[PDB]
Design a protein around this ligand. Structure first.
Ligand SMILES: Nc1ncnc2c1ncn2[C@@H]1O[C@H](COP(=O)(O)OP(=O)(O)O)[C@@H](O)[C@H]1O
Ligand SMILES: Nc1ncnc2c1ncn2[C@@H]1O[C@H](COP(=O)(O)OP(=O)(O)O)[C@@H](O)[C@H]1O
Ligand SMILES: NCCC[C@H](N)C(=O)O
Ligand SMILES: NCCC[C@H](N)C(=O)O
Ligand SMILES: [Cl-]
Ligand SMILES: [Cl-]
Ligand SMILES: [Cl-]
Ligand SMILES: [Cl-]
Ligand SMILES: [Cl-]
Ligand SMILES: [Cl-]
Ligand SMILES: [K+]
Ligand SMILES: [K+]
Ligand SMILES: [K+]
Ligand SMILES: [K+]
Ligand SMILES: [Mn+2]
Ligand SMILES: [Mn+2]
Lengths: 342, 342
């Protein structure tokens, strides 16, 4: 059990119901790196960039290989960083390192000196059977001896998306957090990140549509960025709805959504609309044990009514991007994929 | 002093701060009628339809001669009612009667057996010097004897608008009510009601513009009709702004105004927007002691910053209409006006 606390008040509050204390890196990109070390050298297996920010368990985040927003310069550091750790730790076989990029700064989140649940994905995107190689390494067959020394950079985009069990347990708030709840994953392969994401999304059993009405209800820290997402949705032909606070923000930017009522506000309220199959998309971000408990109804309703909803703005942008793509336009086989690797 | 209470809880409330008790005829048209009685006949001097509904002092309402919404059917009833009263009370010279029209029903508000303040306006509008006629009657000369027996209905519209002294007392909430506060009045002469109104409004020192951003903030009972007003402003080239409840109603109408924060809501709020010159027009209607007190800021700011504002929906519609006119287009003299009368 983990939780994020925001203020002194919040602290106590936890303490009641409720030990390491760690500063939470707000508005940070989460990254996964799987690598192999034989003592001599380090082979970077894969650099995965999470769609959802740090604070949403790696295990529940979608991720891209290669990174789709991060700088080469920045990867390069993580890369250097891993190597440093691999030797220091005296890693012999697989390892996994988790970072967080904040303001062009790399923070270390944790190191797993073992095989991580990402390996099969990486193995598949890159064509390198990371598990076998690392096994060989463990048995006494260097990377050099194996002929696997260069880091592989795929020609295409591989996106990993998760599948959550919320629908089996309705009483639960289908919301993301620092604790992993997903049961499985899918993979999307595309020429563009948008394509890959689009395939991954569909694969995960998404009910996202390419038209209709979107509901925008984001948190403070998101009010600023939501503008561009709304514009993307609008460009896509979506019609918009927004809860007061968010409507305020959009409007000041030149975007007037239809104002919708919260539950305690009037009628109809979002629930009604959700229930009536009024929306095809919901973007809902929150921040705070209270704000969360208060918005629970949006999420439960959406899940219950099969409306695709995102609980992260990052996730929403990705959803938006994927709108430009067509998951059924092109298929490729694993063999072909790997045949493409130089 | 007069007040309008809305519920039992309101009654006590008043009672505390605080007797005739009169049912208040909501959503009613107020009308003024000026006439002369010589004991033999009754001469109708003028039937004036107010713009502001009953509840807004006749002395502070703009009015039209002739009526601009009242059925002939209904005016005739009032004419008959004025004759009945003239004779009964034994009027000898001028009189004035105030009615309220609710649901095609004529209600009597009051009778003033003397010369009323509308007398000069009616004389100007009609070319008949009612004070001179009534004076001769008082002195012995009948209406028949003077050759003034038929009611005059002029070929043009005459609109009277008032000027309020609120600008001299900034602490005062510049809102209309059952008690008179105006100091003066002007008259507008037009081929249409919109033209007369335009001239009257301009004559009243109104800062109304034919373009810009308007702010809508209306009460419950007006939410229905506000849509049509919002559209009308739309047709004109105005951009809209609105507070929560209003925005809600407009949204349901397909009109998406730019949301605006009530003062307790956040920012920016109306005050800021008004203070920063955002608006060129304001329509703000309120009902209830409490609601009024709360909205005080809007009105006080609108006045301080010189934005044209209406405190009645009837007023806003009139304003709406006038936009279709040009008060400088044509001018006519009283001599000319009077020669047009048959
Ligand atoms: N300091 C931190 N700031 C922001 N997010 C963090 C921080 N520490 C952990 N997280 C988030 O919590 C998740 C779980 O943290 P982690 O230490 O890796 O736990 P686990 O052992 O369950 O894998 C991460 O994948 C990340 O999204
Ligand atoms: N019962 C009522 N329903 C609606 N409006 C009314 C009612 N009684 C009076 N009014 C409003 O109050 C105003 C003033 O009332 P009135 O009886 O004419 O007093 P005054 O002596 O000031 O002329 C009217 O012009 C009208 O707007
Ligand atoms: N990557 C986890 C799934 C994301 C889900 N649509 C959500 O935004 O909550
Ligand atoms: N005839 C009354 C003046 C109108 C003013 N603009 C108001 O509506 O309050
Ligand atoms: Cl359950
Ligand atoms: Cl679709
Ligand atoms: Cl926030
Ligand atoms: Cl004052
Ligand atoms: Cl203008
Ligand atoms: Cl009301
Ligand atoms: K994450
Ligand atoms: K761990
Ligand atoms: K009136
Ligand atoms: K009176
Ligand atoms: Mn972890
Ligand atoms: Mn009166």
């Amino acid at each position: 059990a983990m939780e994020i606390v925001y203020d002194e008040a919040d602290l106590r509050r936890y303490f009641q119901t409720a030990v390491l204390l760690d500063h939470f890196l707000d508005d940070a990109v989460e990254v996964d790196v799987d690598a192999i070390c034989d003592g001599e050298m380090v082979l970077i297996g894969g650099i995965m960039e999470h769609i959802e920010q740090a604070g949403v368990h790696s295990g529940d985040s979608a991720c891209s290989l290669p990174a789709y927003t991060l700088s080469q310069e920045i990867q390069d550091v993580m890369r250097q960083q891993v190597q440093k750790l691999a030797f220091e730790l005296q890693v012999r076989g697989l390892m996994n390192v988790q970072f967080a990029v904040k303001n062009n700064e790399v923070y270390l989140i944790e190191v797993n000196p073992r095989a991580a649940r990402t390996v099969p994905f990486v193995s598949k995107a890159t064509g390198v059977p990371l598990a076998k190689v690392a096994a060989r390494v463990m048995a006494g067959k260097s990377l050099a001896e194996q002929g696997v020394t260069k880091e592989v950079i795929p020609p295409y985009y591989s996106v990993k998306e998760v599948v959550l069990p919320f629908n089996k347990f309705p009483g639960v708030d289908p919301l993301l957090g620092p604790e992993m709840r997903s049961t499985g994953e899918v993979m999307g392969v595309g020429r563009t990140f948008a394509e890959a994401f689009a395939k991954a999304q569909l694969g995960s059993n998404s009910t996202m549509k390419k038209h209709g009405r979107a509901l925008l209800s984001v948190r403070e820290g998101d009010k600023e960025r939501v503008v561009d997402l709304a514009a993307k949705l609008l460009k896509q032909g979506f019609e918009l709805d927004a809860t007061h606070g968010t409507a305020i923000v959009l409007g000041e930017a030149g975007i007037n959504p239809r104002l919708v009522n919260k539950v305690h506000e009037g009628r109809p309220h979002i629930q009604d609309r959700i229930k009536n199959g009024e929306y095809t998309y919901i973007i809902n971000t929150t921040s705070g044990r209270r704000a969360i408990e208060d918005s629970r109804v949006i999420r439960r309703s959406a899940l219950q009514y099969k409306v695709h909803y995102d609980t992260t703005l990052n996730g929403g942008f990705a959803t938006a991007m994927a709108l430009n793509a067509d998951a059924t336009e092109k298929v490729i086989s694993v063999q072909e994929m790997h045949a493409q690797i130089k």
